[PDB]
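FAQ
Q: What does a multi-component entry look like?
A: The components come first, one per line:
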Amino acid sequence: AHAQSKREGRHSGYGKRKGTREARLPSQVVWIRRLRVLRRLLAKYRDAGKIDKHLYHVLYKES
Amino acid sequence: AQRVTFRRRNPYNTRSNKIKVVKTPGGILRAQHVKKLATRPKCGDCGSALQGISTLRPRQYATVSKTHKTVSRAYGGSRCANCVKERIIRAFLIEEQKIVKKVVKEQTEAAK
Amino acid sequence: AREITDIKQFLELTRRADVKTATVKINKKLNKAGKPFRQTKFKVRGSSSLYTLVINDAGKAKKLIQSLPPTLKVNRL
Amino acid sequence: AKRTKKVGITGKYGVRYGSSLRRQVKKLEIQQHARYDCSFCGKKTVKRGAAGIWTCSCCKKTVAGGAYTVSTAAAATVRSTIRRLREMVEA
Amino acid sequence: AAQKSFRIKQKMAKAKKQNRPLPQWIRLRTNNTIRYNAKRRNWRRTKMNI
Amino acid sequence: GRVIRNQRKGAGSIFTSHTRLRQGAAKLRTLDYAERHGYIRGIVKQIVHDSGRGAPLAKVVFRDPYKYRLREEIFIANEGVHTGQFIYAGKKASLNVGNVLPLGSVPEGTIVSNVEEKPGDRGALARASGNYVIIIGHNPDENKTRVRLPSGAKKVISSDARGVIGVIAGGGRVDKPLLKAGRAFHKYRLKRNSWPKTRGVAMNPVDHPHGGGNHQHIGKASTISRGAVSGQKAGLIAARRTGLLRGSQKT
RNA sequence: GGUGAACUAUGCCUGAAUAGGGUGAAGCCAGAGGAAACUCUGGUGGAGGCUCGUAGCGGUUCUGACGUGCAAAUCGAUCGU
RNA sequence: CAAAUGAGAACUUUGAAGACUGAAGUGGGGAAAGGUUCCACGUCAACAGCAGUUGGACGUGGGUUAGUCGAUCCUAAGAGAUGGGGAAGCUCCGUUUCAAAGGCCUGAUUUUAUGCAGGCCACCAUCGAAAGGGAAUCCGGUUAAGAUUCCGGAACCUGGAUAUGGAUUCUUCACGGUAACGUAACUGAAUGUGGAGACGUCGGCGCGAGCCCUGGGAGGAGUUAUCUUUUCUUCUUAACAGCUUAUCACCCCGGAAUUGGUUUAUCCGGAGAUGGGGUCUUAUGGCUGGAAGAGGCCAGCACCUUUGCUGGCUCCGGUGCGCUUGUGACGGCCCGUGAAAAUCCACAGGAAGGAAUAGUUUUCAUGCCAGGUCGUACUGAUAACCGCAGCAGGUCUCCAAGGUGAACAGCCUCUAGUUGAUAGAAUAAUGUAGAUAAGGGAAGUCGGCAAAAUAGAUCCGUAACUUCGGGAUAAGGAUUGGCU
RNA sequence: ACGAUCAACUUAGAACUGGUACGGACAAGGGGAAUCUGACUGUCUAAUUAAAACAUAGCAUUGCGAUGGUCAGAAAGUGAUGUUGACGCAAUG
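Then the predicted structure of the entire assembly, as tokens:
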């Protein structure tokens, strides 16, 4: 029941948080997820042909 | 969770006392003792991992056939393909150079 | 502890001159949801290995049990 | 694009050991951890393995060099004088 | 220890055999003043420390 | 009193060198026939770090001249030596870095290292990282090469004494501050048990000539005679002078 | 004249053990300002005989308990790491 | 609390209840040490600082089963004979030294043997690890007490002899692939050479194993004043054999700036990138065999009795910065670069030998025989060790569930274990341990000793000084639940 | 210019609500201005002293080129440094 409530968004406020933001969810893990999503999207777009290799490369560096 | 134990009288986490947890047909968790993994044989010239040669412990190599331990090329199970090719090219090239230098020395001695 | 693929292999194994006991095990497995069939496992016990031939055809299994020599000890269970 | 004004790689030592000693260590640590040209393959792949060992990761060649540089000034000067003496001997 | 040597195990066997009380009939033997085993041992009381 | 630390260091109980991780004694090739009449070509197989040694060592493989064999010699690597390099050792060897010419065959002003003190001892002088020997002169009559040692001393060696051309690799090592008792600990952990060093003034009089007192002071002159004995020789042994001197190499 | 390094001191050889946080070094990527030189910003990365703090190792204070003790040196809190 | 046993029960057994340890356990095992303490039967004089019917006590007996686990073999630091040299000598040094230092291949091979005109060489004895290195075994069942040791089944290794099938052979010692390389095999001495053995640590990333979590379905239990398609619980697959499975690495075609590919981490390409196509290692997973016959979960049968039998089911998924372990490709560190040897294999070379109703191949498959010696029980600690003891001390290590929470601390709970520490009555002083206190706020005191206050997280804000790294969580402020 | 299965836990925001409570037990820094002293991490008087003492990196001095320096041994055809060589070893402050 508490897991269902926490899914719904309860019991996660500032009084319920006892560890730092990085201790709870590492910024490194968040960045890894973000960069992998972006790189996968760029690779898929290039393989589909929606962008060419040069735009893919500049966007890869931007990401 | 069911907890396991060493099957040998060695109670220490030494490199020869590694265990895994496995499920047995009796439905309980047991400790299976694992042996040390085998490292790939290396080339004697360049030192890279030899391909086409199986990875076994040294005595384990005695029970396998000859094909599993070598490649059909010269220096097969000893040196890699690139190093064998490099030493073939080297041998031919510098023996030809030896002939050239011998001829040039003889002709300069004749000139002298 | 060793599979057999072909009936010819089974026949050479059964005449290998060191096998004397065959065990026939019946497994009532399922191939499709509404078709539970009768699978037969012929286990020839050699000196070093236990060879097992899987047969999904009841007719093939019957002809196998009939064609193996009657001198070899067959045990159906 | 610079997180430290002047300590560089010696920010790992914090405030310890004294600024002058940290400055000397900074100089020699930049040299020791730098990457050098390989005179054999022409690529920046030469790293220090230990004091004196300089291994090119691409042509798989080990070189004997300085403790913190692939080549010291004393070594270059000695090579120059040995070349001069060799050519004087040969000719 | 579990992993013993045969010398230690032989000493263990000898100690176990020696650790027994007086047979009743030696008491009745004539001119006898022995009443019990005075060399009796318990594993907690005295260690043979071999 | 008591037997002091420098006296205890000669029994070699805990003070012997830690030689497990070492790579063998670094010695020149045995002076057989080729080294003194012609040359022999060996190949540098690997250059390795030797524990307790600042200089890298070079393993060089030579062909056995009298039998079908390969002989692996352990050399002190000179700066510029690399794997796959050909080393030439002998009287007829050429003046190149890594070669093992005799002193009589090298000219004046040559930089040499791993030099033999007597012909055949397989290397005695200029073996620490960055160190070298200068060839000052020759005396062909009763062949004697004069050299300058890393300390500045002038030495007269036989002209048949071998030596490797160049300087020793690993130079400039002592230019880096250790910064740490930890770095000193890891340095000496595989040299020998000589660190840390307690001062004699911080001991008791039983433990050292300097120990004792209500203040930490030596008490008597710290310059000790050369004729002193063990237990007395603690301090500045046979010091000609003391104090901070403004001076140069003077050599 | 003998016996001790089963405690302990030190070296060596061969093994084993050490949550979770804070800070955020080098290296690298992008951006902004500027005529330029260059400066600045946001990320990334994960250094340190660094730091908070378990296990561990130790033993500051209570000059606490005990002090014919559980104990010929321990117990509790508080502590150092 | 109640039964049972007993002369006798606070303490033994059983049942019920209440609890605790709370998975760096009060659980399951081991190392050193102990030595029978293990287990059963009988029994309570002494011992368990009360008791005792109980016990690690007393009496009598039972119990430890190995080719596969260890030792055994190797070498490490080191110890230590020999040769030789000292010393009056007990003995000291020394370990390849100023030594004439041996064993190892095939013929000789029954006028005589294991001789020799066969041949090769030239190590420095030896001991030293029950955590280093190493040939090989797993599952289920079984005892009062042993089991990776017994039994049933299924394998593996080493050492021996050893025939058959297969492969090769009038191209004598194989073919295929451009290649990486492939296959069932596919001669290989002296001699040489090379690999494995064989190696630190930390960090993130990837993958896998187990565990954790979770959906459906097939059984069992609980709850059901009301609610809950609900809560708890079984749904397992070993060694070993085949097919398949890989990051890395490598090969072929090709020839790149408009530089592209690309990791979380910025490295890589005319010394050949991208792209297309392939080859290998088999960590690891999947399928099949082992193997459902086993184990497990259910329902029923003959009516006291060391008795079994028969029916079903054991299935299909999902998820993740999860925990721990293993592995992989990487990156950081060092004036530190993180054993040796036995042993096994391979390569170079080509000694020697070999046809045809049969030679070679025992590195291909199958088949035959053997595997000795010693340890193995149990504790491993608030009762089996040491501390004079059943001593609040000390003593190495493996496995490690749920919730909260950053968290293997702190609190609570599942599996498992324990409920042991003399008890009853009362509630004086003084104590030990834990607390609280009006108003004041260090006036107490050598001294803020002791205690109190502060405290996690988020946001804001942060001085002097500085070795520019810090100081810094400076200081100082605000917030914190539940529900939608 | 855009569609569907597949519910995974982080963050931010808004009302509403309550005896203003909410890191609700547990867990969990007191802070600041200075002076003396030792740079720091580290170590020691087991069982009254953990310190400002020892160590330390840094600095300086000393000896020594091997038939050597420093040290060991009764002696030795004996040893440690030393599988070493002045960027070293040894001795001090």
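Q: Is there any commentary attached?
A: Sometimes. For this entry: Residues 13-16, 18, 20, 179-183, 185, 192-193 of chain F lie near RNA strand G (CB under 10 Å from a C1').
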